[PDB]
Design a protein around this ligand. Structure first.
Ligand code: PHE
Ligand code: PHE
Lengths: 76, 76
């Protein structure tokens, strides 16, 4: 499984923006879970699985999340 | 915190559409977790902050009758 972790600044629609970006890149989730960040009081972390057909978008959505959104992101 | 548990039909952008509804109603999540369900669906466990309460009747309307999700639980 493709595993991706990212951290977002807390606000309404924070996750929705990420998922819109995923959808627009034909990325499809098989798992999501959140937890409050232990590092920053104003951040939430998200652990996701993506299906294998999402692989061609993977390098690129990582860069977009970091660049367009300012998320901290890591492929696991 | 408001507990809301619902299923969606599996498709690219399934969750994005729901989170757009939430966002447009000023609903803020504090937790999300998915699980595969019904073979072609996913179940979502969410918590909404108390400030989301004025939105509940509208998001339930749209979730049930527009998006066509099944709501398994709503509790506060
Ligand atoms: N595969 C769907 C539903 C889904 C979302 C998140 C986790 C698991 C399933 C999507 O990407 O929107
Ligand atoms: N509160 C933010 C981030 C978040 C999403 C989902 C779960 C937890 C936190 C939002 O509603 O988008």
């Amino acid at each position: 499984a493709i595993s991706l972790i990212f951290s977002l600044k807390e606000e309404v629609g924070a996750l929705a923006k990420v998922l819109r970006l995923f959808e627009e890149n034909d990325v499809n989730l098989t798992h999501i879970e959140s937890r409050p960040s232990r590092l920053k009081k104003d951040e939430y972390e998200f652990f996701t699985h993506l299906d294998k057909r999402s692989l061609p978008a993977l390098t690129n959505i990582i860069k977009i999340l970091r660049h367009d959104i300012g998320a901290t992101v890591h492929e696991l």
